């Protein structure tokens, strides 16, 4: 008499298929990019450019002294 | 004493990558729901020290099929330069201050594909003949993809040398100029060293317990290598003139995180099946590596941005 078959208490599980967890897509993507890499370019220009402002301060020494 | 300078960065960079293989299979261990060397340790911290004694105890025996000159003679070279390529290398203070060494370690490195032309050819047959020969074909191909956009990035920091190198990313982090440049860097570097993804990597095989250890310890060597030249190039730390510890502690830390990516890298991805692994290179990589070297040339000169020297 003390067999299996449980009355109740069921699911399933799911054969589902699915997980689009996107992800901004769609020209939001490329715009972090080129804003970002300009940024990097706007970095530039006041370092190099203070850097040749040292280096002629550089070069000023060498050309002071030596006669 | 300028010796003990020398025998205390050989050294202390031997128990660098052998106490890495213990790294590199716990790191392995903690994905696939497993723990680290477990009997030995306790740590672990106990493995490597026995495994290195096993690898001279065993006989090495040797091909009576080969010559003798030419086959212990790749494993001189193999720690001779993958070795040497250490030396012009700040952290902040290098060995050898070189006025150019950015094309040092470039002329260092075109040798490595020089010593498994040795192994395969002078063994044996087919395996050892044939299939040796593809993977300096290969790495033949990985240095024009490395040496061009390695170029681009000297038009902007300024000259050749590396201690000038610091002092133009002081501010920067210069993979925000160039996460271009930073795929095509990493990818290309991954790719030379013979590992995961890009591999097809008989050179190995004929090698018994002796020499095996060696093309194992050398191999290795590279790997950390790509890594602290990575490092100094584009994730440039601080430096502080009256504190010198200070650089070396967030200097070595930064490239131990990107020591991890290979060992990481290597749990995710397939082969790449040899006709398409140089077919991704020039009809997909070169020609992307040309039009951002055409890049970094019109930019410095349209902001009158040139960099000093
Ligand atoms: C206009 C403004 C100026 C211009 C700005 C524009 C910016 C553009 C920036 C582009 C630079 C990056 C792109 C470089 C090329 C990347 C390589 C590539 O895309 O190849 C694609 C590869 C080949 O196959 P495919 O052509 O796609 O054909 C199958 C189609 N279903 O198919 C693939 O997708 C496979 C991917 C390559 C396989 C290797 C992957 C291994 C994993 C590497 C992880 C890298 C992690 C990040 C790098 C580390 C950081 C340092």
Same mark, same amino acid.
């Given at each position: 008499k003390q067999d299996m078959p449980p009355v109740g208490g069921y699911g399933p599980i799911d054969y589902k298929r699915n997980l689009?967890?996107?992800?901004?897509?769609?020209?939001? &993507?490329?715009?972090?990019?080129?804003?970002?890499?300009?940024?990097?370019?706007?970095? &530039?220009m006041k370092w190099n450019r203070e850097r040749r402002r040292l280096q002629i301060e550089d070069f000023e020494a060498r050309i002071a002294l030596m006669p | 004493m300028f010796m003990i300078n020398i025998l205390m960065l050989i050294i202390p960079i031997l128990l660098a990558v052998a106490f890495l293989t213990l790294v590199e299979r716990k790191v392995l261990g903690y994905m696939q729901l497993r723990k680290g060397p477990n009997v030995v340790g306790p740590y672990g911290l106990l493995q490597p020290?026995?495994?290195?004694?096993?690898?001279?105890?065993?006989?090495?025996?040797?091909?009576?099929?080969?010559?003798?000159?030419?086959?212990?003679? /790749?494993?001189?070279?193999?720690?001779?330069? /993958?070795?040497?390529?250490?030396?012009?290398?700040?952290?902040?203070?290098?060995?050898?201050?070189?006025?150019?060494?950015?094309?040092?370690?470039?002329?260092?490195?075109?040798?490595?594909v020089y010593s498994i032309l040795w192994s395969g050819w002078a063994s044996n047959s087919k395996y050892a003949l044939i299939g040796a020969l593809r993977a300096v074909a290969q790495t033949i191909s990985y240095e024009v993809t490395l040496a061009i956009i390695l170029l681009s990035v000297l038009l902007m920091s300024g000259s050749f040398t590396l201690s000038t190198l610091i002092t133009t990313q002081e501010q920067m982090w210069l993979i925000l100029p160039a996460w271009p440049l930073a795929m095509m860097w990493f990818i290309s570097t991954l790719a030379e060293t013979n590992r995961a993804p890009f591999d097809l990597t008989g050179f190995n095989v004929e090698y018994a317990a002796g020499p095996f250890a060696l093309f194992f310890m050398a191999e290795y060597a590279n790997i950390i290598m790509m890594n602290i030249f990575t490092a100094i190039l584009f994730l440039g730390t601080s430096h502080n003139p009256h504190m010198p510890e200070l650089y070396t502690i967030?200097?070595?830390?930064?490239?131990?995180?990107?020591?991890?990516?290979?060992?990481?890298?290597?749990?995710?991805?397939?082969?790449?099946?040899?006709?398409?692994?140089?077919?991704?290179?020039?009809?997909?990589?070169?020609?992307?590596?040309?039009?951002?070297?055409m890049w970094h040339v019109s930019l410095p000169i349209l902001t009158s941005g040139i960099p000093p020297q």
């Open positions: 689009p967890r996107r992800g901004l897509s769609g020209y939001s &993507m490329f715009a972090v990019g080129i804003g970002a890499l300009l940024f990097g370019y706007w970095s &530039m | 020290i026995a495994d290195a004694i096993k690898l001279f105890i065993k006989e090495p025996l040797r091909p009576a099929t080969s010559s003798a000159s030419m086959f212990i003679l /790749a494993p001189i070279m193999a720690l001779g330069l /993958a070795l040497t390529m250490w030396i012009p290398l700040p952290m902040p203070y290098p060995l050898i201050n070189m006025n150019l060494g950015v094309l040092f370690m470039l002329a260092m490195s075109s040798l490595a967030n200097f070595t830390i930064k490239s131990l995180l990107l020591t991890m990516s290979f060992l990481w890298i290597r749990a995710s991805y397939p082969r790449f099946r040899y006709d398409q692994l140089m077919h991704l290179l020039w009809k997909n990589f070169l020609p992307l590596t040309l039009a951002l070297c």
